[model samples]
Target: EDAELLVTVRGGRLRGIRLKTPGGPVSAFLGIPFAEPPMGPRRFLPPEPKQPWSGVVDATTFQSVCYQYVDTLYPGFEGTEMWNPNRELSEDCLYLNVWTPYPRPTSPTPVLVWIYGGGFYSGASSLDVYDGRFLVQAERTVLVSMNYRVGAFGFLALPGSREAPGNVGLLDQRLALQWVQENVAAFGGDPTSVTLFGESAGAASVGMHLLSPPSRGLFHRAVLQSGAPNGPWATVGMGEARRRATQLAHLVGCPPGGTGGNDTELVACLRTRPAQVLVNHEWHVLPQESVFRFSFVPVVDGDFLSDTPEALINAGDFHGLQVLVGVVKDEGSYFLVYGAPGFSKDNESLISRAEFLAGVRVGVPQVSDLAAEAVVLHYTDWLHPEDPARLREALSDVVGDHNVVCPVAQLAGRLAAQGARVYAYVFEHRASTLSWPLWMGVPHGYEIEFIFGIPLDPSRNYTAEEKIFAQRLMRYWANFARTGDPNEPRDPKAPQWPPYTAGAQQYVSLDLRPLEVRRGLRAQACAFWNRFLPKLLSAT
Candidate 1:
């Protein structure tokens, strides 16, 4: 370490490290406890703030990741392997990391807090891609990332029980946010200006915070990348959550319906079981109807979330917060590679029309056969011959629309309609580091690398365009965090990002060509998924 970096917050004194970035040196405080270890009696329960420490706690080393389930869904697939746990995992994993420029700001700096995404099942704040040094050094803003429990341990619901209220994972994020509110000022961060941003399920978590009453005022602005609260798999009913928890318990030999039909015995049994066994059995609890769904995820528990995300959004129950929402061009290509490996076995392979139809059914099993056919017809291109490659492209579009793209657009439009300032974009720049085939155009999370300024890492060889793209992205994000307007302190080099409104529906297309402002992102596809499909499903 260059010099001992110390910061005293409410919790206690912390010893951080200084690391060199291309822009300058940055101060990093890694593996600081935000919440108490959720082990023994604390498993499956909401987090409590870490008790103030007695000494100058060492926060230089990255801590253990939350106990994670192996990727049984797509074992050893490169797409899945990238997210697999690379470090020791333990039940004691309620930690966070912070990074600020070496010369701490004299005045309060804007803060951007990141929530990692792994389909709500796997993620760690310590991932190399999420390292915040480059972003902090370049943007001159403070960056924070917190780890939360995932999989069954975080989301298992025992209805009517104080022990296992669902959404403890979300609660973990909330508690971490609370920690930020109280302690970030000590790290030279603005308590008033905080931006909560994430991708996939992490973005969904940010969306949930927008709707959640408890999370109000914790963050002033929010960023949703490739996810929304209304995304099909973002949340589930309390009944569904209870059923899965019971099923998970049953699989682990701690059957429900013990004494007095109470969940007391069931929860007690699960608390004593090995943590690995609980996660290992999670895949088995996915019901047939929920084949693509994670076994455990956020639930519409009355405590954390009072209603469904759609209902909440329509009712305008969310805080009047500034929002930035967008999706990659090919959000579903990631799932296609791992969720259905056969579709992308080779770069040259093409998807037949029949295979496309089957893929549609798998993607939208809830829809009626007639609706599925309608979806196929809507996405299909009849102007040309029945090209297998085109069909494959159509299927990818359908999956992307249904799962991520449409929901994000719909949410942006709704938020703007409600008089909230919203900025939307589509990240079209595919990074050179992502080894996926060219067909997987800018697949779901590759934007995160640029967002976190991974291209700036000197050890890795990145093209000039990529490095420029990362710098521009960092500016936009930091500007948004600082003033809630991405265009402000405007960069002459990058295009102005227009505000998305109901009338204009304008959004920026983020690519290496700098940026382009466009109108109506996937309007017809979103109308089908957000408006038409809902009516069709309800009527059927």
Candidate 2:
């Protein structure tokens, strides 16, 4: 086993290390910068290429996380923590980590780039759940994980802030993919065979990539874990985002366009204030707000993004790229337990409020009380058997459907309609080790363990049945990543997998008793939303 320390194109050298595995030697490089730090005057702007470094840099440690305090959103995050051991946040963070079975000189392999998700507000590549060792060695693929600007720093769009508008974090993601295209071969990754995969907001960003002109040909395939197109959470229009930014400016004492009074010169004044001041201000005020409360997110700016991702997908915008998309059954349980509990209570009321807020914030006059009622009725009916627990589940389903499943289904259906191959699945196996009560059944992101083939922590040990279920899931995922079809059964006990077709859409269900080819489960809320919600809510 030999390990070599090396520098990146930016001239920063990280120690390239090697690990001995059952297969052979595995090469790994850590803490490589893909873009310059978004600090000082560069905050809110697109990332720039870092200057070349001089010598071999030590990549022994992970880079600093972007300027974000460890909130309760993500538990067990791995990064540099200032005051909170559970959290790692910093401004000088624009780095990524790479794991490869072999170095570039040895061979070129398929690349899988992972984007972590924390509602576009928080997340880091250093999380333990994201360890790529198994995938890289088992599949002999190159895996890359990166940190992009988040929250206000990455998504904020003040009036006249810049020519590009919002979704700076998304732009940062694009730049990282661009970096992979340019440099993945050096890490023994086939740049042309790259696959971009992410969860939650990271998945949402991947959805944005499907629409952005700048992202053309950057990745060949995408994996959207629990995020999708077609709703406020999935895609925010630039006009609405600008209004939110204006609101944020007012809160930070930087009113848009310089109010010509004490508040009017806010931007000029804020430009001189410390970047930490703005960061502190945003966290204090906006983090708890709904998805519509932010000026950040992938805004439908006419440039980087011309129209909404939903419209683009329906119009068959993306090229014939393969997709693997799915959501967990009890998807909302995690968010209800870990981040926000309010979602579990009176979800119908909350959805009503979300619809109302979407209209009010977007200045859409068409979103009348009647329209809101129709949306509530449609979603509530779709979520039948509205028991208290089921209501919570329904809310989660709606959140997932609007935010992820629906968009993916629409994209997949459209691509397949356009002669593209798409595979979809639903992970329903509840994690054995997941804390009880708070997380009942297959909670959101529960597939992480199965995806990595990790054993449940002793405290969260699974029963024999659960272990078998997990193995099947891992095999399906590994098989899919190896080839386009996830139907290849790894074990005799595994069910026969089938490819997704328009009329007979087939999806693998991961659970105690796995099944395939279940029908009528597709989320049809997209058509209802696109046709009715926007029309009723359109302010004009």
Candidate 3:
């Protein structure tokens, strides 16, 4: 029996749990605080360092999720999609969990830190899907999963004040990384070899930290799954953030631009309100037809985020980065459904000019109407429109590419161009358990099942080949965690993953079988986006 494992963190002793695994017993330190709860005065401000505890503190369970509702009012995967954590939500939610392999290895083991993503609004580290048991034992690496502030509590920006600043969630993650730097070694982890991995907003957060000055020296490598800081919903301007913040305050019956004070009174009123009150309210809620309708997201506060990711990348402003970035083959299918206005399965009406404009607006919000039209034309497959289902598929192609695919590839290209060691992949793996049909493509969060070995039970089990593929994937990912390189696949049968070069641009096609490397992934579509879009915009 693995019992009563204790570790001293921040000069305080903490009792953790030990569980038997296939690799042997592993110690799990659950719900350890890396920062003070963002409550009282701490609400909306950057995360404060966790105060030291005196006695042997019970760390078996603590708050593992930030403020978020259990229900999903809007469309998309809500109300227990994938794996709903269903933990008690609270603003006092800056906690992290750890899983270290049993009977410590001879030397310092590599650490893999997971930051969950929910479009920057709904996510928690407590999700059973994110459990570190299988991955920890498989890789023989220390795994850490953390919960950061979300919704208005995390991303609300009120100019400059004590009440709240912008990008609190991003800062929460930074603090978590800092905690790992200072304390992970005590848990038998190599702080130097930390790899930050996440999907969606969490992936965007990882990219945000790549250039964030304070986050430097935190993690050496990154694996961005289906997201980047440059992704549409990743970050917003201070101006937009201010507008949304004021709107939220007004909606909650707190006026920001009247009476004795403006911003101060608004913030003071908000602080006095219950955290759940602010949390439960609809934030940044936009039209049902909008692409990136999220209001509460990380933003440029002139402090945490100095500039847009594109600007920073163009200026060559970033810390040391070794990245493995990729997107799903059909990321936009589920995305377009929500992003579009009044999407219907009928298909013909789904490809209307309005829908095209919505996709263009979502993907290239900065472009002029003429330029957006050109973008729509460039991506549209006229022939496919003949059939209603085919038209939906064709439009979905454009929508997904513009929304996720191009952005992901563009970032990979940008990093590679900057002479960074980057590896890219396209996740096209389909599980038999997938309830959604082919038209659904692979949803945005589907890869998590494969990555974390979370069961996808259609028939209650994975196939023989799929099981092998899962093992190969775990090994590949673990190898990357162990060493910076996914190295040469230890299994001679598996193909070697090549680094993404500037011009070569080779990427691994992540599939169940016949997995191969391919060049020019969506080559023409990327050209239309990266090359033609600019030309057309300039012409317009």
Candidate 4:
């Protein structure tokens, strides 16, 4: 093996870190520029490929993360989310990281490219929890994570014009995928066999890429966890995007310009302003307009995505590929407790029906009383029929199903119906030690610890079974990357995972205690949302 961890990329040669793995040493190429810094004149424009360097570039350390909302409000578990704030911050955060078992392995290894989710508003590739050393070691596959423009810097759609075309973030990711196709081979990855995977908003982005014609051949398979483009909050209309852009411009003192000469004026003024001025301006929509909507998110930009994922799936316009998709058992607890404003501080325990319905109204205010009553009827409290405390449990079920599980279920069903090879799962194991208990169900992002094989600290610890389960989880993912099938004999104890079909609708239940398949994963809850959404939410 070469003493220096040097690999040639499109931009130039990169000297990465030689991280020790269980199998052996692996190379981690961090913070390599895939596109020109999207700052100054490059703000809001589609990413341009980075130029080649004359000499080897030091990539052992991470660079500035994308401009984003920091902390729990935007969302990151204190001990869990792997962000290192010491790194620099910038709008020019168009970089990528690679971890490979070998710089040039004898046999080309499959690649797993990750896109992180934060309501499409926040995330970075530099987070410690997202490290790829263990995954690469466990599966002998190439792992990648990237930094894309986020919040306003990425999603600003200025009134249908090219100067500030919408969805620069989506475009940014597209360029990164293209970069992987062109550059990953040098890192011992098989470009044609790249498997795209992500959770939450990142998962939504993966689903969007599937519908996007430009991204078709860049990936051969996908793993979408707890999010899809069809979900309620994944997208917004051009009208809303334009309005938000104008609001952002007004907040930043840009001329409300989009005319013969005004647009140039707007672009010029915005470019001149410091990037921090733009990030500080993040804000949610007026509660009256929509109780549940993200201020900055993917828009119906005609280029990246022709239509919403639901529309695309219905019309059979999406690209066909093998898939692995699922949602955490209690996906909404994290969002409702942190993201929703009205929920009480001690929401970890003791919630009343009145309080629960009120929080629902705060999240989605349009629900008529009858519909609210219908929700109560559907998400029944088995142990306590009229128990006020049980309402909190009901709320978790509704929010998790509506926001995460059901939509991804729809995605899986549609893909399966289209004859695409699909494997589905539901992550239900609460970390035996992690303290996220609201009625005691496993919450959103519970699977991340297992997915990344993050070790617990002395202050906290995961059971031996959980640790072993993490190993099996990585193997399943790696197996899928190697072949389209995840049930490629990772664990003898793990049951045979069957393909998800529209009729059978079976999925593997992923709880560390003992993983098994359940014929119907919350079928009743999903049915309610399928019939419920068309009336309340507008499909953009």
Candidate 5:
């Protein structure tokens, strides 16, 4: 038996459940359907809002996650396994969850919406690590996580066909935000004070929302963790989008009718195929050159995306909200362990010079032989130890800069140049509980636990320093959501974080003690990526 936690929303009155979180009891409403099931005839189309319900709907149980392939590539890697969907999967999975402090706040509070990331192929809102209970309890703000479709089901562009337009996954997110706008106020949330945030592919999704015309005004603030819209792997042009969709149809035995004449027929045949079959074969559809990239991703559709991300960012066309961007110190170390072997298998394992060069070519696929040679020459440490370990660090730097960090840095700079309020940071602290090796150096997505205040739970055995660190981080995140500035309503323990400017190029480093503010994070490497490499490519 539990106390009633009812809230009247758009469709009907939802009866939520109160849970005993680490910080305290939180009112949690799980699996609230935001849209009608996107199955059968509705598959691959933009999500339609759920109609009114008759009775008090139960929002206590978590529902099925969006249909996605279980990861078999990494096998034993905890990093990859941590992101896999742990719940049941289905096409009718456009549900959302909400968590707020019990005995709800007297006044309207800020809202934070989370979007999960699995390279646009696999992810779910119900992952254990993503529990918003602790975050809601500690921060005293509402937390929302939504399940959006992924892989081919979300982004299969059938070029020149109205039946199968792409970017429906992003459209799913948009509809959820619209739901929030119409419904969050009932939960003691300030719909005007919503902050949209995500990591990896989800971060790229947040960046896409900033540039997308349809997603404007849905949120007032944003936080991008380790990814951006124009990152090398985030999106593809219409040509590549169409090619991948056609290849997938071919693999699934659906004839493309020789030309663009029968795309609707091809899509109709694909709709008849099983969901698992489409996701399983999507991997094989990737070309050899695109081995490191995702098969289906957002496209530069004339509607959802009017122009290229780079062009829009450069032209100051994105929604200028308070933006916070950050990346781990060694994001590539985590990716390299699975993507390319011998980079960080063990302390004894080493990367040879040849492997380092090949890694640059593979990681930065757009680079020509000459461009990659320049990259290899730029990162090769001449003064450092000439041992195999030196090559390991160099290769990690090349991949990390090209694939993650530099693109984010370039985005922050461009936004700041256009007079947009932006903040940036580098997360250098490694957690004690992470099972990764010592050389991993605070790998990708490690800051998530700290951001969500998981260390606040006493049973987790987190260190005292980590507990303080988590509190300080949560305060910063919540403060940013409430006000535009992360430092406002700030804690005395945390240092003042300054806004990033094009001229100063300042950013904070998230680690214990002094809470140092630094300028020029890997300036030379980022310069090579944002400036030198592009000029070299044009010349080549």
Candidate 6:
């Protein structure tokens, strides 16, 4: 296979260039600019449109990531052998990359927009795991991945900051989608057939979009992997969120309610402060929970986000959209080692902690309390039983349920009730080679390789069974993108995926032998969450 090197021009410079892949003559244009470099005055404001170039810009080389704090929680930052190769970070990181099967104005292919996740703090479209080569070539879709504001630079909200307001990161994502809708035709993509998909925080961001007024009709479909809209962190109140931001500002040397100045002066002072100083203050002041840090979440700011996404969706606000939502079997296992210590293994300790955290008795007679206790018991028993492996699975499930699973189930149910198309799945295949003693099953992001149909790293020594599962999983995902359903006739080995309705709620389970039409496994958990969601929001 001969490789053809090409360069595309943007902003009057040779900005992006790339080598054509092997199998097909798929033309890829890398590092395309969708928004301007968010620097100086534009640092925290909504994304500004990119200034077009007079000549062709070089579409090669991955762009630098936005300024981010190091992942010190991961042991690899030290001399640990487990660390993935480190990439440099900087503020001049507003660029996005594209992998198109055909880079022509005539091709109008389906578009797959990916949002990488790292607890709303880190992760990039440039990561090696997100390589969209196979998806683009095999599925014949235009793969688009771009960077959004992360941490303080992306999410910080100040009293009078003008560059970007609250949820600027989310606004950046909305702007990116708008860019796709307007310019994707030039890159062989159908903007109308767009699918917004993401994992972890990325998935959570998609949930926010479903409720955000700015994101309506921007994308036709959404795929939320292991995150939901109703969790405690998603629809935070503006007062609480602003308080958190004020505290963060004080930590960063720009105290709120200015000592001798007004709101405008304080905001200007904050905008000019060193970026590193703000980042360090964010790291220090943020609570242990990864989702609550940085103070840049989608605020319930009467205009952009009218109410909680869960409340709006449940009220039939998003009846016109189709959705695919689910969580991995052991989605929470990755967080145990990545950052903070998890819940106690003892049942008593778990119950006590839940009570303390919720400020209510766990076994109270109220439906909400019972529901909360049911969730606590399910997870505790799953983790603290006689079997050590079961204990790990339970802990992971608990985190997964709270952070991703239960919330997603709620969203799906609400959408389904409103007569929208909804499909659900549970990824259960454990990576054999990479499965560690502690990580008894698949970790949080185990599905990425399968979703994109990328080859597993040789070092992981993936087995034949794993390879077969990955192939099937890829087909299922691609089929869903091509059509809103994962059932494709070309792949006879594919599982039978039934649409999720009120009575016969069907969900496909991806495991050793993919099964379909399963019921009752997650029903109780979903019920418990749905019944208690409003109370949780009110309390928070």
Kindly report which residue stretches of model 2 are placed more than 4 angstroms away from their true locations once superposed: 1-13, 18-25, 72-87, 102-105, 159-164, 255-258, 261-268, 283-295, 317-319, 335-367, 375-390, 436-440, 456-474, 489-494, 512-515, 523-540
What are the runs in model 6 whose C-alpha is more than 4 Å off?
1-22, 77-86, 102-106, 159-164, 256-261, 287-295, 317-320, 338-393, 456-461, 489-494, 532-540
350-448 per-residue lDDT for model 5 (tens digits): 877667666666676766789877876787787763467887777777778887899999899888888678989899889988877877778778899
lDDT of 3 by residue, 337-426 (tens): 554654643343445555555655664556777876676576666665344455556566766676677777888888878867888888
Question: lDDT (CA) for every model shown?
Answer: 0.84, 0.63, 0.75, 0.77, 0.84, 0.66
Residues 1-540, model 1: lDDT tens digits: 344388888979999988888768889999999998999998888898899989999999789999887665556666557777777989999999999887888899999999999888899998888999999999899999999999988888876688898889999999989999999888889889999999999999999998898897798899999998888888888788888888788888885445345687788889999998997788787765322467788888777787888888888833466899999988877677545423754575487766777788777757788898789778889885369889877878888888898888888888988868999989988777776778887888889989999999989889998898889898889888888899956456646788999889999988888677899989978888877877787867
Tell me the TM-score of each prediction against the true structure: 0.95, 0.82, 0.91, 0.91, 0.95, 0.84
What order do candidates take by lDDT, descending?
A: 1, 5, 4, 3, 6, 2
Give the total clashing residue pairs for model 4. Answer: 3
Whichever of 3 and 4 has more lDDT, that candidate is 4
Error of 3 at 47 (Å): 1.1
Please, what are the lDDT tens digits per residue for candidate 2 over residues 1-540? 344435345345567776554446666776787787776667667788877777776665677777653554434432112113223566778888888765444666677889887777677887666767666666567788888987777776643446325677887888889888878766667787777888877777877787776796798888888776554564565556666665666666665554664422444455556656666666444433333223356676677776777667766544467778777776544444333334432233233434323422232122467765565566454444344444454555544554456656666667667766777778876665664354245655667766754553234356877656655665566566656566664556646666667667677776677575575335466566545566766744
Worst 10 contiguous positions by lDDT, candidate 4? 284-293
> Mind giving the per-residue lDDT tens digits that candidate 6 earns over 1-540?
213334333334433333344445466666777788878777777788788777656666677777766555434332122222235677777777777774343666778889877666677777767878767776678888888878878876653345335777887788888878777766667878888899878888887787776787788788999877676555566666666666666776764454664545555667788877776766565444342223455666656667777667767555667788877887655554433233332222222343322322211212355455555565555344445445445555655666566677777777888867888888877665453443435767777767876553344456877766766777777777778777896766645688787667788788877575687437776565556554664663
Runs in model 5 deviating more than 4 A are: 1-4, 74-77, 256-261, 289-292, 317-320, 344-348, 383-386, 490-494
Task: Indicate whether candidate 2 or candidate 6 has the larger lDDT.
Answer: 6
Q: What's the true lDDT of residue 416 in model 2?
A: 67
Clash totals for all candidate models? 0, 22, 1, 3, 0, 16
* Clash-forming residue pairs, model 3: 289-341
